[PDB]
């Protein structure tokens, strides 16, 4: 049929895989988790976990995507038994969109707040918000006595605006009674999905042309933000809050399980977008240096983002003598509540707010485009009938996403948003990457993987990467899954408590993605006629190796394959 | 490909088309609408409207289904412009299922109430029901003083059981706050859809074998019910309430618009099931006598059902000296509230309740099976790929119906149930039958229809049926649509009032089916390359007549075709 739509240049692929990993400052609280674990003695464990998690997994994803020349759905053509997981990493990705674009819509709403001269968070006098008239006191404008305020003060103008005008949480008591979607967030999501459709309908060319412009803004924005911070007096102390070096605070099973999830969610390994991007890349490329550069760029971006956030926190603590630890809202909209107020204190709040919201929209749109392109490529390579009708398929996917994201744009959508995000992302993606690592290291074998790499690359991976693929990565993923399952805490908002049935609904939604593996295994086992040893052979051997099944030449049954290093 | 799955015998087709039109006593209040219009001077207008509406439309549906040999989706192969409506009558049917099976589930629940020795409606002492403890007084067990009771008494044991144990309406204040689906109705709907899947997955053979047994029960049940009624003393007066002959009460625009909808909803003309059943019938059949027999059977069934209901009402009025007019609940579950209590007064309530619930389940399952088979046949004849995979398609349809019927099986589902039923059924089916009649009488022409009939039948329809098809039926349908649109009243429950946004949601849902015609017309007009006169010709001429389009031989453009009688 039609050949693969190769990228115009390697720079487009590089910028795309970079912009896919800049969502660390969107909704993820990186500096909060950094300060939570060992205070400032977090850099070394962070780097160690980042390496051992991403680099082997990123190299594996890139190599399996480039060599197989197909989407993540059929990327398991060498082992159909695990091919079911190829579906999982697709559907899970869609689940992410179900909330992700919603967050983007929130940022878009902030754009409509930045077009005016008087920002809504500057004045609490019913400026595009409906306060409860309980304590409408400016945190900086109205200077009053400093009190503990029950160690929780959610009456700040920015938080009030975010909760009343953006979320309308006051008209929703919980998750049992939700309500109706907001007309503003609905139009914002419509604009977002229309942009995504007009970008993805053509192919990878428009995607590259968009990420070539969108991914170049956050660097300049973070640079000018760090400059404006270091020019402010209250940043220095904030720096002291960023890295409070305490090697003795590294408690057992405290700093590791909280650092293994943030890097895993920020890098995006096993999410299915890497295979989709590698499927359109040239067959002759160096995934090693590209993966190293991507990991280093992601680490530097996380570091500078945490530094900027802690500088903003230090300047805010300089603005009001109350402590910044228990006064901030460590929720989904942490960047939407604390950061705008600082912009109110900075001169020329309009331009800074506009450029910050543009950076947020760009870094969200890039990740959403990548996540949707992964699903598109997977379902196109799986079903060839949908390969030619790319525009109609993209329109249908966007329409289904808009219809199924209404539960997240409503008044009480943030609760279901956090529920879906946490449960689905954590559980499903962890189980999927665990199954992928197992299938690649034990069933397919790292020897054939290294041979394919050496055939398509100028060198062969040494013993280090092979051991990391075989024994380090699967054991690490299994440990993370065991910690997430055993040490499971019931989900709860900052103040709101989730009902018991919500936890079971979240567990069912998360398990709906992981049960696709045994169902597909049973389907493949039943769709093959013959003896058990022949069905297992057809399931463990690649398609083009099926002729060996009649010859009874299977290396997986040999003990030398399981112990092959 | 595979030929048409012809029925085993004509008796199967007859029993199927009969059992499809026995849903008049399920949720439809036939005797209430009879007594509302002219009291007892309803038989003559009822018969006139029944004839003029069904017989021409039923003959047209049967002939168009038998001659075209295809489902309702592609039955417009002679005129693709109206082919869009072929989709409408499909989707609308599914909408009906979205509530219809739910009602069936209710009846199934009553079966679980009839298996016990002590019926729940007999004793109000918390017998499988949670009363509000306001007025737990037996209507017949506790003899008290007769009062007006504010002209509305909804505290009867049967109504209390139906509202608390079956619906759980007390935990739902309205439609803005719905809640969670009930676990009993969920399992009932699961059983219903599993039976529908195990019946429809094979084809028309199992459908005929099921309707050959299910459609034979309601006759015996109605016979024994009429016998037990005429043996009761209080039936005679009830008969006087059934037919109170008053020719002077036939007010203008009062008895016609209320009788034109009941017959139209009971007969089922234009619903799409008739074409689906005729598509599997032999090419040589007499649709005239079959349609006449079907109409006569439906009329006799409606008459005997109204007689039985009014006899039950008269016996209930004999049980308690209070009037039966304003004490009954004229809602969806009228047969579920008033009729069981009478069974409590009859000796051996167990057997009578069991056989009545079995009759209800059979007459609901037959109609649901027909409505789903219509959609199956339409989407199979439209997309040939789904023709071979009939079992998987039926499973998917049943699963989607079960997933989309959760809003009707919940605590507040009855409000959305009535909303969807009324809006969708009335508006969409009326617009669909109007468009079908117009396309058959004016665009295709009654002359070619009569010629095809004479080719496939032993005689040609006279001037009467041709005039009824051309000038009577379209004008009648247009008048009914105009009355429904202009004389539109806001929907409201017996006591609950619907919010304003619910009316707009219902209007949008109803219009979503009717907008499929202009969209499909525009799609067909844009999918044809050429001049406007050639596109119109391709849109109005049949497919096999497309060769005439190049010859510029189009009879529709001639004035003799529009005036052809």
Curated annotation (Swiss-Prot), chains A, B:
The Gene Ontology CC terms held by the record are:
axon; cell surface; membrane; neuronal cell body membrane; plasma membrane; presynaptic membrane; synaptic vesicle membrane
* Impact noted for substituting residue 97 to A: Decreased norepinephrine uptake
> Which CDD domains would you find in this protein's record?
SLC6sbd_NET
- Activity regulation, short description: Inhibited by mazindol, desipramine, nomifensine and nortriptyline.
For the Extracellular compartment, the record's topological domain ranges are: 37-40, 115-181, 231-254, 311-350, 413, 494-496
Processing after translation: Palmitoylated; palmitoylation regulates protein levels and neurotransmitter transport.
Annotated consequence of substituting residue 100 to A: Loss of norepinephrine binding
Residue numbers binding dopamine 2: 330
Question: What are the binding positions for dopamine 1 in this chain?
Answer: 23, 93, 265
Q: Name one GO biological process term.
A: neurotransmitter transport
The effect of residue 83 to A is: Decreased homodimerization and norepinephrine transport
The record gives the effect of mutating residue 271 to A as:
Loss of norepinephrine binding. Abolishes norepinephrine uptake
Write out the function statement from the record.
Mediates sodium- and chloride-dependent transport of norepinephrine (also known as noradrenaline), the primary signaling neurotransmitter in the autonomic sympathetic nervous system. Is responsible for norepinephrine re-uptake and clearance from the synaptic cleft, thus playing a crucial role in norepinephrine inactivation and homeostasis. Can also mediate sodium- and chloride-dependent transport of dopamine.
Quaternary context: Monomer. Can form homodimers in the cell membrane; homodimerization is mostly mediated by cholesterol and lipids, and regulates neurotransmitter transport activity. Interacts with PRKCABP.
What protein am I looking at?
Answer: Sodium-dependent noradrenaline transporter
Q: Which organism is it from?
A: Homo sapiens
GN (gene name): SLC6A2
């Amino acid at each position: 049929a039609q050949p693969r739509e190769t990228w115009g240049k390697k720079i487009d692929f590089l910028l795309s895989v970079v912009g896919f990993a800049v969502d660390l400052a969107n909704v993820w609280r990186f500096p909060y988790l950094c300060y939570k674990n060992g205070g400032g003695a977090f850099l070394i464990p962070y780097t160690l976990f980042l390496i051992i998690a991403g680099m082997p997994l990123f190299y594996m994803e890139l190599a399996l995507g480039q060599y197989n020349r197909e989407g993540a759905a059929t990327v398991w053509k060498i082992c159909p038994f695990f091919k079911g997981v190829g579906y999982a990493v697709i559907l899970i990705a869609l689940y992410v969109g179900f909330y992700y674009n919603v967050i983007i819509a929130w940022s878009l709403y902030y754009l409509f707040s930045s077009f005016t001269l008087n920002l809504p968070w500057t004045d609490c006098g019913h400026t595009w918000n409906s306060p409860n008239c309980t304590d409408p006191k400016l945190l900086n404008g109205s200077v009053l006595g400093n009190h503990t305020k029950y160690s929780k003060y959610k009456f700040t103008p920015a938080a009030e605006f975010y909760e009343r005008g953006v979320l309308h949480l006051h008209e929703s008591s919980g998750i049992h009674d939700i309500g109706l979607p907001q007309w503003q967030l609905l139009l914002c999501l419509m604009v977002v999905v229309i942009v995504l459709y007009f970008s993805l309908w053509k192919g990878v060319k428009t995607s590259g042309k968009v990420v070539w412009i969108t991914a170049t803004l956050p660097y300049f924005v973070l640079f000018v933000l760090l400059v404006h911070g270091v020019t402010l007096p209250g940043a220095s102390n904030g720096i002291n809050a960023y890295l409070h070096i305490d090697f003795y605070r590294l408690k057992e099973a405290t700093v590791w399980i909280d650092a293994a999830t943030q890097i895993f969610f920020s890098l995006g390994a096993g999410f299915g977008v890497l295979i989709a991007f590698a499927s359109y890349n040239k067959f002759d490329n160096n995934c090693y240096r590209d993966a190293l550069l991507t990991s280093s760029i992601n680490c530097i971006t996380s570091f500078v983002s945490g530094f900027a956030i802690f500088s903003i926190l230090g300047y805010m603590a300089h603005e009001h003598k109350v402590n910044i630890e228990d006064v901030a809202t460590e929720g989904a909209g942490l960047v939407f509540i604390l950061y705008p107020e600082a912009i109110s204190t900075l001169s020329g709040s309009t331009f800074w707010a506009v450029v910050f919201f543009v950076m947020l929209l760009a870094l969200g749109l890039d990740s959403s485009m990548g996540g949707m392109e992964a699903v598109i490529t997977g379902l196109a390579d799986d079903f060839q009938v949908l390969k030619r009708h790319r525009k109609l398929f993209t329109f249908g996917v966007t329409f289904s996403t808009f219809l199924l994201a209404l539960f997240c744009i409503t008044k009480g959508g943030i609760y279901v948003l956090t529920l879906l995000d946490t449960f689905a992302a954590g559980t499903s993606i962890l189980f999927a990457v665990l199954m992928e690592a197992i299938g690649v290291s034990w069933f397919y074998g790292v020897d054939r993987f290294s041979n394919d790499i050496q055939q398509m690359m100028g060198f062969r991976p040494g013993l280090y990467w092979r051991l990391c693929w075989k024994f380090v990565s699967p054991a690490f993923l299994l440990f993370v899954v065991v910690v997430s399952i055993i040490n499971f805490k019931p989900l709860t908002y900052d103040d709101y408590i989730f009902p018991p049935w919500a936890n079971w609904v979240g567990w069912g939604i998360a398990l709906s993605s992981m049960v696709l593996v045994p169902i597909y295994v049973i389907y493949k086992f039943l769709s093959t006629q013959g003896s058990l040893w022949e069905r297992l052979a057809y399931g463990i051997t690649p398609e083009n190796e099926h002729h060996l099944v009649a010859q009874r030449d299977i290396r997986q049954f040999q003990l030398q394959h399981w112990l092959a290093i």
